[PDB]
């Protein structure tokens, strides 16, 4: 699986890939950062209740029409056009079409570009539109191309998959254990806040993480003892692999310097 | 506790003890993992309020009868049969009867197998059934035979008994101290949320762990000062032996690799 | 290490000071631990509303009389008698009269022994009885003579006085800063939960410690930004000197080994 | 330690700059510390509802008039006069006038002195006075001249600007991600507590920091899963650069000793 070998990539790839190459490259990087931030702000702003009241045709969050009256649609279209231009230039300057599914920073652009085109295509089994609108948030991840800190975070997450899986596994074990314990310790009352073990999962996760919401809490003596143990075990279980993940992050962090 | 090695049970012990020995061993390990997960899911699902609201057939969550119409009973019986087969094969290949109370990974199977048979026997004071049903959750601990991370967690807990006991001791000391302080600082009011020191134990544990529920909180100036000190001392007391436990976990974790 | 030096109290000092010296010494240590625990449980139990509701017989929690009908008074008197006997023996074996400000493990006994006698004398202005009954809780600290862990905790606290003071100083700085910020950011509304900066002190301490109660929370945009900064700065400020205190504890902990 | 250049600056500068130089210098340092604390207490006390309710007379908290009847105005005027005297003496005795815009310990005095004079000038929109009163709290930062711990904290903050920025960046990324996820997972109900993504920003910050308020919480299954992930990712994101900041603090802390 060799590279395309077009011999056409070099100039545009250097212009749009290395911000330090030239002054125009730095200008392009700054413009890209501002466009990403503008798209993020617009995405967060379309959800405000000021605009939701006057809105198949509603799950999209924007009105696609020839007139293009919605300012949010205008901003989203401009940002999507810029992202499309960037991706097309880089891909026509990207030799390794085979390694396209290996680089995360290009499938990130794919993810940031796909939702608009799916919504346009489907305008011309129902939760699909909501799922796409949710996936559209991953345009936040496109800032990783411009920030080395997010790249180090990505490398840390890649290197700490085993420790992250262990953290999730220990959380699952403790959540099941303490949810069962608190459900059975607070089962013989009508005022209990734990109708079921899956309903106690939420309380268990909230207590182990030591977040603490108060939406559901133990009321019995045994339930309170179980909650005490839940808090202690949550502290311990979280503290076990977090130092390993932190050491990975520090190694990848001071490696660049 | 190794296998007898009589040259007759050797094949069965190799199949049911070393998943990496052969392809069928890996299949058996995967089937065991799926059966354990199925049992956990079924156990968590019988408690859903779909069935409890329409209330020995009630405290157990499953109806033992000739017809055997309950699907949850069918799933539990299948999982218990598989666990019974596994334990019987391994014990028939396990010589060391003297170390019956020493091995944890086989008394775990005993614990996962016992509640079903006690409930069957006792179907033919009253909190015994609830205690048995609560103990039945420990089939979650049976996943430790297949995951090395849970084995490392068990080794860490065994190696950090003194530090864990010190953590619990410091928690008890601080809880008594701050429960007394907040009870006495918030005693001369009709709206106090601390009827007694044992009732302030819950608030103390919640504050020292920094979970934070809001179900009971100080309302006086002295009570708020006491709660401030409670939060600070809880952070400090938890942070004292957790690094020792974490160092133990990291040692046992990087020991395997 | 040296003897009491009285030339007479050597045998009693060996019996009552070194639990490992002989079997009777271990018996005395176990009896002392049980008596301390019994006193702690009785102190925590006199405050239960089962007994307090029948309403100095209420400010003190025990009725001092010739009949001595109250079981709590009987238990407290027995524990105080045992503590008095221990203190009399050890003080008859304690040389340093002028060292009133230095030794802690004997002024702990002084604190555990005063409240009963001072309340008996003062029975014969009003907050004195409540303050004494609060001080009576420090009998929990008398367990430090029997536990090496609490002794190591005391040595850590003595060695980390500067770092603990820095922690309290940073907490005070951040609490003042964020209390002022959240009071001024949430001042122009009728439903604000921060009537004053000292009233915002409680919210600041709760947020910096990341305990989280919800009794008072920001409701404005600026108040929510201030609370965000408060949580971040609380995490950072707590995390600054806690590692130093933890290193002190670990040094004093592994020193015994 | 540069030359005075005036033939007059040296003596006053040594008196008002080095507390350990002489007894009067230590007296001046103690008086300055007491004056700073008195000003802080007065500032925190003017906001109490006892005084604010019975009232340009409300935005400032003090009435500037010839009579000067307000005790809070008297205390603030005395503290401002002392700060003015200190700053004028030090500036008259300060050789390096060039580094005034770079030195932080003198612009801190400028910030502590400016609000009083601006309010006096403006007495002789409306949010300007409130902003000035809020800025007036930075007199808390003037204690850094007298405490070496706050100086070490300042050096740590200056040395850990990149890591602090990374912490804020990761917090922003996670907050946007989880706010969008929880808004979309809890959108199709009448009782949703997340009207918009910016309204979910508060919940995200509260959950990632593990503070936990309960003012808004997920109610759906998907919302609860999103909140679980939010708590886990908040723990991880906070734990990534905090050890680097703590190492910076420890380096600057043991450097002095």
């Amino acid at each position: 699986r060799p590279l395309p070998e077009n011999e056409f990539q070099r100039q545009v790839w250097l212009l749009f890939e290395y911000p330090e190459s030239s002054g125009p490259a730095r200008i392009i990087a700054i413009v890209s950062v501002m466009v990403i931030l503008i798209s993020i702000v617009s995405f967060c702003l379309e959800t405000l209740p000021i605009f939701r009241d006057e809105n198949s045709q509603s799950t999209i969050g924007y009105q696609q029409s020839t007139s293009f009256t919605d300012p949010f649609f205008i901003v989203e279209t401009l940002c999507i056009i810029w992202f499309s231009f960037e991706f097309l230039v880089r891909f026509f300057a990207c030799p390794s079409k085979a390694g396209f599914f290996t680089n995360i920073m290009n499938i990130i652009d794919i993810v940031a570009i796909i939702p608009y085109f799916i919504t346009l295509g489907t305008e011309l089994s129902l939760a699909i539109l909501r799922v796409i609108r949710l996936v559209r948030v991953f345009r936040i991840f496109k800032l990783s191309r411009h920030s080395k800190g997010l790249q180090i975070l990505g490398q840390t997450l890649k290197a700490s998959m085993r420790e992250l899986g262990l953290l999730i596994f220990f959380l699952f074990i403790g959540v099941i254990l303490f949810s069962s314990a608190v459900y059975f310790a607070e089962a013989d009352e009508r005022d209990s806040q734990f109708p079921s073990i899956p309903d106690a999962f939420w309380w268990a996760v909230v207590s182990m993480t030591t977040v603490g919401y108060g939406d559901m809490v133990p009321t019995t003596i045994g339930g309170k003892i179980v909650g005490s143990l839940c808090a202690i075990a949550g502290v311990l279980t979280i503290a076990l692999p977090v130092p390993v993940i932190v050491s990975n992050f520090n190694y990848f962090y001071h490696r660049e310097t």
Side-chain angles (χ1 to χ4, degrees), chain A residues 156-185:
Chain A
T156 303
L157 295 187
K158 274 135 190 93
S160 292
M161 287 276 168
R162 189 177 173 231
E163 289 100 63
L164 180 58
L166 271 187
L167 183 49
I168 301 295
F169 194 57
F170 293 173
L171 280 149
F172 154 86
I173 300 295
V175 157
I176 297 269
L177 208 69
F178 291 118
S179 297
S180 325
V182 81
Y183 170 75
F184 291 128

mmCIF file of all heavy atoms in Angstrom, chain A residues 156-185:
data_model
loop_
_atom_site.group_PDB
_atom_site.id
_atom_site.type_symbol
_atom_site.label_atom_id
_atom_site.label_comp_id
_atom_site.label_asym_id
_atom_site.label_seq_id
_atom_site.Cartn_x
_atom_site.Cartn_y
_atom_site.Cartn_z
ATOM 1 N N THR A 156 -1.439 10.668 25.927
ATOM 2 C CA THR A 156 -1.608 10.085 27.253
ATOM 3 C C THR A 156 -2.791 9.127 27.291
ATOM 4 O O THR A 156 -2.703 8.043 27.878
ATOM 5 C CB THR A 156 -1.794 11.191 28.287
ATOM 6 O OG1 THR A 156 -0.677 12.084 28.234
ATOM 7 C CG2 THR A 156 -1.912 10.601 29.678
ATOM 8 N N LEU A 157 -3.909 9.515 26.677
ATOM 9 C CA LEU A 157 -5.070 8.634 26.643
ATOM 10 C C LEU A 157 -4.777 7.370 25.847
ATOM 11 O O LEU A 157 -5.227 6.279 26.214
ATOM 12 C CB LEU A 157 -6.276 9.372 26.063
ATOM 13 C CG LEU A 157 -6.792 10.554 26.883
ATOM 14 C CD1 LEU A 157 -8.086 11.093 26.295
ATOM 15 C CD2 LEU A 157 -6.980 10.159 28.338
ATOM 16 N N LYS A 158 -4.035 7.497 24.745
ATOM 17 C CA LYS A 158 -3.660 6.319 23.970
ATOM 18 C C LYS A 158 -2.744 5.399 24.769
ATOM 19 O O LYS A 158 -2.892 4.172 24.724
ATOM 20 C CB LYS A 158 -2.991 6.739 22.661
ATOM 21 C CG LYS A 158 -3.963 7.023 21.528
ATOM 22 C CD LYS A 158 -3.611 8.308 20.792
ATOM 23 C CE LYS A 158 -4.716 8.717 19.829
ATOM 24 N NZ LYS A 158 -5.688 9.656 20.452
ATOM 25 N N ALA A 159 -1.789 5.972 25.504
ATOM 26 C CA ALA A 159 -0.834 5.177 26.264
ATOM 27 C C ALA A 159 -1.418 4.607 27.549
ATOM 28 O O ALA A 159 -0.878 3.627 28.074
ATOM 29 C CB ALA A 159 0.398 6.017 26.598
ATOM 30 N N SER A 160 -2.497 5.189 28.065
ATOM 31 C CA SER A 160 -3.107 4.768 29.322
ATOM 32 C C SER A 160 -4.468 4.119 29.099
ATOM 33 O O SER A 160 -5.395 4.307 29.886
ATOM 34 C CB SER A 160 -3.237 5.946 30.281
ATOM 35 O OG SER A 160 -1.967 6.391 30.716
ATOM 36 N N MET A 161 -4.608 3.353 28.015
ATOM 37 C CA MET A 161 -5.856 2.635 27.782
ATOM 38 C C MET A 161 -6.055 1.525 28.806
ATOM 39 O O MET A 161 -7.178 1.293 29.266
ATOM 40 C CB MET A 161 -5.884 2.068 26.364
ATOM 41 C CG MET A 161 -6.085 3.116 25.286
ATOM 42 S SD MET A 161 -7.823 3.525 25.033
ATOM 43 C CE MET A 161 -7.682 4.997 24.022
ATOM 44 N N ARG A 162 -4.981 0.821 29.167
ATOM 45 C CA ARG A 162 -5.090 -0.229 30.174
ATOM 46 C C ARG A 162 -5.489 0.338 31.531
ATOM 47 O O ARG A 162 -6.369 -0.209 32.204
ATOM 48 C CB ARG A 162 -3.770 -0.989 30.281
ATOM 49 C CG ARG A 162 -3.845 -2.236 31.141
ATOM 50 C CD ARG A 162 -2.524 -2.983 31.138
ATOM 51 N NE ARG A 162 -2.520 -4.088 32.088
ATOM 52 C CZ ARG A 162 -1.577 -4.287 32.998
ATOM 53 N NH1 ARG A 162 -0.535 -3.478 33.101
ATOM 54 N NH2 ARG A 162 -1.679 -5.325 33.822
ATOM 55 N N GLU A 163 -4.858 1.438 31.946
ATOM 56 C CA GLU A 163 -5.176 2.027 33.243
ATOM 57 C C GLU A 163 -6.573 2.634 33.250
ATOM 58 O O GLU A 163 -7.287 2.546 34.253
ATOM 59 C CB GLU A 163 -4.130 3.076 33.607
ATOM 60 C CG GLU A 163 -2.781 2.489 33.966
ATOM 61 C CD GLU A 163 -1.789 2.567 32.824
ATOM 62 O OE1 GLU A 163 -1.453 3.693 32.403
ATOM 63 O OE2 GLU A 163 -1.341 1.504 32.349
ATOM 64 N N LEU A 164 -6.977 3.262 32.145
ATOM 65 C CA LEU A 164 -8.332 3.795 32.053
ATOM 66 C C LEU A 164 -9.365 2.676 32.104
ATOM 67 O O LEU A 164 -10.401 2.802 32.771
ATOM 68 C CB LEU A 164 -8.476 4.614 30.771
ATOM 69 C CG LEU A 164 -9.824 5.268 30.476
ATOM 70 C CD1 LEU A 164 -10.235 6.199 31.604
ATOM 71 C CD2 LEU A 164 -9.754 6.016 29.156
ATOM 72 N N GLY A 165 -9.096 1.569 31.412
ATOM 73 C CA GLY A 165 -9.987 0.425 31.490
ATOM 74 C C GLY A 165 -10.058 -0.161 32.885
ATOM 75 O O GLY A 165 -11.124 -0.578 33.336
ATOM 76 N N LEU A 166 -8.923 -0.206 33.586
ATOM 77 C CA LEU A 166 -8.928 -0.667 34.971
ATOM 78 C C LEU A 166 -9.737 0.263 35.863
ATOM 79 O O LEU A 166 -10.456 -0.196 36.756
ATOM 80 C CB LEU A 166 -7.501 -0.789 35.496
ATOM 81 C CG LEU A 166 -6.829 -2.136 35.262
ATOM 82 C CD1 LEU A 166 -5.497 -2.173 35.972
ATOM 83 C CD2 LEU A 166 -7.727 -3.254 35.747
ATOM 84 N N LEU A 167 -9.616 1.573 35.651
ATOM 85 C CA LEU A 167 -10.406 2.523 36.426
ATOM 86 C C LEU A 167 -11.894 2.298 36.202
ATOM 87 O O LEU A 167 -12.678 2.254 37.157
ATOM 88 C CB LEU A 167 -10.014 3.953 36.055
ATOM 89 C CG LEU A 167 -10.709 5.076 36.826
ATOM 90 C CD1 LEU A 167 -10.649 4.820 38.322
ATOM 91 C CD2 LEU A 167 -10.092 6.419 36.485
ATOM 92 N N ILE A 168 -12.298 2.128 34.941
ATOM 93 C CA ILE A 168 -13.711 1.908 34.640
ATOM 94 C C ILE A 168 -14.179 0.571 35.204
ATOM 95 O O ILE A 168 -15.308 0.449 35.691
ATOM 96 C CB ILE A 168 -13.958 2.006 33.123
ATOM 97 C CG1 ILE A 168 -13.537 3.381 32.607
ATOM 98 C CG2 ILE A 168 -15.419 1.754 32.803
ATOM 99 C CD1 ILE A 168 -14.365 4.518 33.157
ATOM 100 N N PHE A 169 -13.321 -0.449 35.153
ATOM 101 C CA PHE A 169 -13.676 -1.759 35.688
ATOM 102 C C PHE A 169 -13.877 -1.705 37.198
ATOM 103 O O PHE A 169 -14.853 -2.253 37.724
ATOM 104 C CB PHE A 169 -12.592 -2.773 35.317
ATOM 105 C CG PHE A 169 -12.999 -4.204 35.512
ATOM 106 C CD1 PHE A 169 -14.114 -4.716 34.872
ATOM 107 C CD2 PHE A 169 -12.255 -5.041 36.324
ATOM 108 C CE1 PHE A 169 -14.484 -6.033 35.049
ATOM 109 C CE2 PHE A 169 -12.621 -6.358 36.503
ATOM 110 C CZ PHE A 169 -13.736 -6.854 35.865
ATOM 111 N N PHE A 170 -12.963 -1.044 37.912
ATOM 112 C CA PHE A 170 -13.103 -0.912 39.358
ATOM 113 C C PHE A 170 -14.332 -0.090 39.712
ATOM 114 O O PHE A 170 -15.041 -0.398 40.680
ATOM 115 C CB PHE A 170 -11.851 -0.279 39.963
ATOM 116 C CG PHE A 170 -10.619 -1.136 39.864
ATOM 117 C CD1 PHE A 170 -9.386 -0.634 40.241
ATOM 118 C CD2 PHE A 170 -10.692 -2.443 39.410
ATOM 119 C CE1 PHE A 170 -8.252 -1.409 40.157
ATOM 120 C CE2 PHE A 170 -9.559 -3.221 39.321
ATOM 121 C CZ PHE A 170 -8.338 -2.704 39.697
ATOM 122 N N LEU A 171 -14.599 0.966 38.941
ATOM 123 C CA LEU A 171 -15.804 1.754 39.161
ATOM 124 C C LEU A 171 -17.053 0.906 38.977
ATOM 125 O O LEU A 171 -17.988 0.995 39.772
ATOM 126 C CB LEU A 171 -15.827 2.951 38.215
ATOM 127 C CG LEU A 171 -14.968 4.140 38.636
ATOM 128 C CD1 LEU A 171 -14.463 4.873 37.413
ATOM 129 C CD2 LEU A 171 -15.754 5.073 39.544
ATOM 130 N N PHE A 172 -17.084 0.076 37.933
ATOM 131 C CA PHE A 172 -18.231 -0.796 37.701
ATOM 132 C C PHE A 172 -18.414 -1.786 38.845
ATOM 133 O O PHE A 172 -19.536 -1.996 39.323
ATOM 134 C CB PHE A 172 -18.054 -1.516 36.362
ATOM 135 C CG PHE A 172 -18.772 -2.835 36.264
ATOM 136 C CD1 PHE A 172 -20.098 -2.890 35.876
ATOM 137 C CD2 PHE A 172 -18.105 -4.023 36.520
ATOM 138 C CE1 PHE A 172 -20.753 -4.101 35.773
ATOM 139 C CE2 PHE A 172 -18.755 -5.235 36.419
ATOM 140 C CZ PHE A 172 -20.080 -5.275 36.045
ATOM 141 N N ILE A 173 -17.318 -2.395 39.307
ATOM 142 C CA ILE A 173 -17.402 -3.354 40.407
ATOM 143 C C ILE A 173 -17.965 -2.681 41.652
ATOM 144 O O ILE A 173 -18.922 -3.170 42.270
ATOM 145 C CB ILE A 173 -16.021 -3.976 40.688
ATOM 146 C CG1 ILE A 173 -15.484 -4.710 39.459
ATOM 147 C CG2 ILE A 173 -16.087 -4.911 41.884
ATOM 148 C CD1 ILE A 173 -16.289 -5.915 39.060
ATOM 149 N N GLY A 174 -17.388 -1.538 42.028
ATOM 150 C CA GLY A 174 -17.847 -0.848 43.221
ATOM 151 C C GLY A 174 -19.270 -0.344 43.093
ATOM 152 O O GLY A 174 -20.037 -0.374 44.055
ATOM 153 N N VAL A 175 -19.643 0.125 41.903
ATOM 154 C CA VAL A 175 -20.990 0.641 41.691
ATOM 155 C C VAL A 175 -22.012 -0.474 41.846
ATOM 156 O O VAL A 175 -23.027 -0.309 42.526
ATOM 157 C CB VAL A 175 -21.090 1.324 40.315
ATOM 158 C CG1 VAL A 175 -22.527 1.351 39.832
ATOM 159 C CG2 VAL A 175 -20.527 2.726 40.390
ATOM 160 N N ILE A 176 -21.749 -1.635 41.243
ATOM 161 C CA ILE A 176 -22.664 -2.764 41.402
ATOM 162 C C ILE A 176 -22.763 -3.159 42.871
ATOM 163 O O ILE A 176 -23.863 -3.331 43.418
ATOM 164 C CB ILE A 176 -22.213 -3.950 40.530
ATOM 165 C CG1 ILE A 176 -22.269 -3.581 39.045
ATOM 166 C CG2 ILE A 176 -23.053 -5.184 40.829
ATOM 167 C CD1 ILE A 176 -23.579 -3.908 38.372
ATOM 168 N N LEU A 177 -21.611 -3.268 43.539
ATOM 169 C CA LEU A 177 -21.589 -3.719 44.927
ATOM 170 C C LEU A 177 -22.381 -2.779 45.830
ATOM 171 O O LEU A 177 -23.281 -3.207 46.564
ATOM 172 C CB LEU A 177 -20.140 -3.828 45.400
ATOM 173 C CG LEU A 177 -19.800 -4.836 46.493
ATOM 174 C CD1 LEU A 177 -19.938 -6.252 45.967
ATOM 175 C CD2 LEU A 177 -18.393 -4.584 47.002
ATOM 176 N N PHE A 178 -22.075 -1.484 45.769
ATOM 177 C CA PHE A 178 -22.705 -0.531 46.670
ATOM 178 C C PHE A 178 -24.141 -0.223 46.275
ATOM 179 O O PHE A 178 -24.960 0.066 47.151
ATOM 180 C CB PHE A 178 -21.871 0.745 46.739
ATOM 181 C CG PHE A 178 -20.560 0.559 47.443
ATOM 182 C CD1 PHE A 178 -19.365 0.757 46.779
ATOM 183 C CD2 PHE A 178 -20.527 0.166 48.768
ATOM 184 C CE1 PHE A 178 -18.165 0.574 47.423
ATOM 185 C CE2 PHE A 178 -19.329 -0.017 49.417
ATOM 186 C CZ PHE A 178 -18.146 0.188 48.743
ATOM 187 N N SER A 179 -24.481 -0.298 44.986
ATOM 188 C CA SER A 179 -25.873 -0.162 44.583
ATOM 189 C C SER A 179 -26.717 -1.290 45.152
ATOM 190 O O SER A 179 -27.806 -1.048 45.684
ATOM 191 C CB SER A 179 -25.974 -0.132 43.061
ATOM 192 O OG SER A 179 -25.308 1.000 42.538
ATOM 193 N N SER A 180 -26.226 -2.530 45.069
ATOM 194 C CA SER A 180 -26.954 -3.640 45.674
ATOM 195 C C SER A 180 -27.062 -3.463 47.183
ATOM 196 O O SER A 180 -28.138 -3.649 47.769
ATOM 197 C CB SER A 180 -26.268 -4.960 45.333
ATOM 198 O OG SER A 180 -25.717 -4.915 44.030
ATOM 199 N N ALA A 181 -25.955 -3.083 47.826
ATOM 200 C CA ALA A 181 -25.957 -2.936 49.278
ATOM 201 C C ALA A 181 -26.938 -1.862 49.733
ATOM 202 O O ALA A 181 -27.675 -2.061 50.704
ATOM 203 C CB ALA A 181 -24.547 -2.620 49.772
ATOM 204 N N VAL A 182 -26.975 -0.721 49.039
ATOM 205 C CA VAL A 182 -27.836 0.372 49.476
ATOM 206 C C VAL A 182 -29.285 0.118 49.078
ATOM 207 O O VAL A 182 -30.207 0.589 49.754
ATOM 208 C CB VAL A 182 -27.322 1.719 48.934
ATOM 209 C CG1 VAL A 182 -27.755 1.935 47.494
ATOM 210 C CG2 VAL A 182 -27.797 2.857 49.819
ATOM 211 N N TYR A 183 -29.522 -0.619 47.989
ATOM 212 C CA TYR A 183 -30.890 -0.993 47.660
ATOM 213 C C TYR A 183 -31.463 -1.930 48.710
ATOM 214 O O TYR A 183 -32.601 -1.749 49.156
ATOM 215 C CB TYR A 183 -30.946 -1.641 46.278
ATOM 216 C CG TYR A 183 -32.284 -2.272 45.965
ATOM 217 C CD1 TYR A 183 -33.383 -1.489 45.644
ATOM 218 C CD2 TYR A 183 -32.451 -3.647 46.003
ATOM 219 C CE1 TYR A 183 -34.606 -2.058 45.363
ATOM 220 C CE2 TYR A 183 -33.671 -4.224 45.725
ATOM 221 C CZ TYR A 183 -34.744 -3.425 45.406
ATOM 222 O OH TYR A 183 -35.964 -3.992 45.125
ATOM 223 N N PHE A 184 -30.686 -2.931 49.130
ATOM 224 C CA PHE A 184 -31.194 -3.882 50.111
ATOM 225 C C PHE A 184 -31.218 -3.304 51.519
ATOM 226 O O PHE A 184 -32.045 -3.718 52.337
ATOM 227 C CB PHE A 184 -30.369 -5.167 50.069
ATOM 228 C CG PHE A 184 -30.565 -5.961 48.812
ATOM 229 C CD1 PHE A 184 -29.482 -6.370 48.057
ATOM 230 C CD2 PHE A 184 -31.837 -6.294 48.382
ATOM 231 C CE1 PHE A 184 -29.664 -7.094 46.898
ATOM 232 C CE2 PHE A 184 -32.024 -7.019 47.225
ATOM 233 C CZ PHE A 184 -30.936 -7.419 46.481
ATOM 234 N N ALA A 185 -30.332 -2.352 51.824
ATOM 235 C CA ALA A 185 -30.334 -1.745 53.150
ATOM 236 C C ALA A 185 -31.476 -0.753 53.318
ATOM 237 O O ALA A 185 -31.838 -0.413 54.449
ATOM 238 C CB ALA A 185 -28.995 -1.060 53.415
#
